């Protein structure tokens, strides 16, 4: 119970404590390791366990909401975080007020014991945004069912080995020039301490493949927490995402997402 | 156990946790209240429970030692901290690296729930200092015993009501132009989680009265922890302190100390 040491319970699985500072700064803190979250081993690229980049967006959405900034105006990923089998890593989310109210900087960092701080993401938290649009029918129509059989075996062949907690893609269609998909977590996935569980958040992004890593995010908003199943619409003409729950209520919008390509401890 | 939230156990009663930050900053954090440390009610000035100013020096000595800076080059007190009967207060000690190694800034802050941050002290942590001198005989000789009967009743009459944990002065002599004193904690005082227990630290300073508050500290060094009884020598020609334990081993030096005179919640 962190209030006994003058901190605030922060209500997130990855950053359970928050440290208000006289800076106008607020810092969310946690410890990441595979024994604490074994399902993190289900995100392995080229034999390395990497923290999914969408984890840093999820943390920004959580910190920004707690700070009054319901929008991730901008988040840019930098160095990846590789989790060894033995590794334990301190994590920080640092939110800093600016000279313009309603706009705050955010940065994400980690540190291993015998090591220095590493910056994993930097960005800007903002107020509000465009309202989401409704889901008038599902699936969209004139939409052709796509064969997603062995979709994950295909990704594995290109080096992206998605484990049980990340194999969330269930059905997909081509809808005009857009991609639409049903994506859902395995049954019994605990999502209480997340805004959007990383495995479902990641499958929302990696479904664009019907094998790359997210790089830069613009205008991300989360409208609902605790969602375990999504209906997703992806538009590559400005690489944007909309997600609704099974009843069509809005869950997530990404105004723009740009991807990128491929150090680290040794495997096994 | 704060390591589970990515922090460090800091080993001090008032600041049990430390937050390393990528700033090069390190922050010690705690919660202060009279139910957690009821002996803090034993330091009451003009009816107000004030945190003794020497608490901020003790915290600086603890943080500086953990950061490699064995000297409080400089600490200047600002706003006092008044503890209400009901009050709970978050405290921070913020240590920041500078452009000159071996020298770091330190600042002390508090915040009540419905309130803003308040700065209680600012200063500079440094490396090393002058070595302490030995204690060749005790008491010093040609030293005349001073009557310290009702010393605390006298202080009370001027508004300084020292309670059991702070009534540590036992014997005093005039030694030439210097003051020397034996000062010790009540039996059974737990000092495990302090460098120098605040009640004994404060009695070292307030013994100068054979009724004022500390203001500015220069060149403070703590040579030993866990001491419960002190032999003290005060020199008003540069308002300096030396303290040894009962066996003459060095405990504390204050290179220079300047005092000062007299908001707050309502008593009772």
Author numbering:
A (entry chain A), B (entry chain A): 31 to 239, 301 to 359
From the primary publication:
The dehydratase (DH) domain within type 1 modular PKSs is responsible for the dehydration of specific C-3 hydroxyacyl-acyl carrier protein (ACP) intermediates, resulting in a corresponding enoyl-ACP. Here, we present the crystal structures of the borrelidin DH domain from module 3 (BorA DH M3) and the fluvirucin B1 DH domain from module 1 (FluA DH M1) at 1.80 Å and 2.01 Å, respectively. The DH monomers from both BorA DH M3 and FluA DH M1 possess the traditional double-hotdog fold with an invariant His/Asp catalytic dyad. Within each DH monomer, the substrate-binding cavity contains (1) a hydrophobic tunnel/phosphopantetheine (PPant)-binding region, (2) a catalytic region and (3) an acyl intermediate-binding region.
The borrelidin PKS from Streptomyces parvulus Tü4055 utilizes a rare trans-cyclopentane-1,2-dicarboxylate starter unit. The first DH domain, isolated from the third module in the borrelidin PKS, is specific towards a trans-cyclopentane-carboxylate-containing polyketide substrate. In the case of BorA DH M3, we were unable to model 11 residues between α3 and β11, suggesting a highly flexible region within the DH domain. A lack of modeled residues between α3 and β11 is also observed in the erythromycin M4, phthiocerol dimycocerosate, curacin F and the rifamycin M10 DH domains. Surprisingly, the same flexible loop region between α3 and β11, where residues are either missing (BorA DH M3) or have higher B-factors (FluA DH M1), form part of the acyl-binding region. From the catalytic Asp located in α3 to a conserved Pro in β11, the residues between them form part of the bottom of the substrate-binding cavity responsible for binding to the acyl-ACP intermediates past the C-3 hydroxyacyl position. The lack of 11 unmodeled residues in the BorA DH M3 acyl intermediate-binding region would yield inconclusive in silico docking results. Therefore, we opted not to conduct substrate docking analysis with the BorA DH M3 model. However, no electron density for the corresponding substrates was observed. The lack of substrate binding may be due to high specificity of both BorA DH M3 and FluA DH M1 for their native PPant-tethered polyketide intermediates 1, 4.
